[PDB]
Amino acid sequence: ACDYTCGSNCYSSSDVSTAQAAGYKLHEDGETVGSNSYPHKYNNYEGFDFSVSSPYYEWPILSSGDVYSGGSPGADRVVFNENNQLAGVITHTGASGNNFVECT
Known part of the structure; x- marks a missing residue:
C-alpha cells in the first residue's frame, strides 16, 4: 500500500522500514555508507510531520529495496530515529536546492 511515492517510488511506511533498518543498523554500529556520513541527524524543519520522536535520522x-552505499543515493530519502522508526519520506523533488520534502 505505497504511502510514500517520491515522484517515482511506491514504498509505504512498510517499505521505508526496510530502508531504515539499513540506516539504523549502520547507525547502531555508528558506521556510514558511501563517501558521505549517512545516516545522520536530520532535525526536520522544512515542515515535516514526523509522527516519530527525535532525534531524526x-x-x-x-527504489530497489536495498541498502544504499554511496554519497549520492537519490532524491528519495527516508528519515527515522534511534528507535527504529520512520520520520517519513523526503525527496529532492525540486525541494528548491539540497532541501528535502516528504514524498507523495
Missing part, C-alpha cells in the same frame, strides 16, 4: 531509500 536521514537515510536514502533505494
Whole structure:
C-alpha cells in the first residue's frame, strides 16, 4: 500500500522500514555508507510531520529495496530515529536546492 511515492517510488511506511533498518543498523554500529556520513541527524524543519520522536535520522531509500552505499543515493530519502522508526519520506523533488520534502 505505497504511502510514500517520491515522484517515482511506491514504498509505504512498510517499505521505508526496510530502508531504515539499513540506516539504523549502520547507525547502531555508528558506521556510514558511501563517501558521505549517512545516516545522520536530520532535525526536520522544512515542515515535516514526523509522527516519530527525535532525534531524526536521514537515510536514502533505494527504489530497489536495498541498502544504499554511496554519497549520492537519490532524491528519495527516508528519515527515522534511534528507535527504529520512520520520520517519513523526503525527496529532492525540486525541494528548491539540497532541501528535502516528504514524498507523495
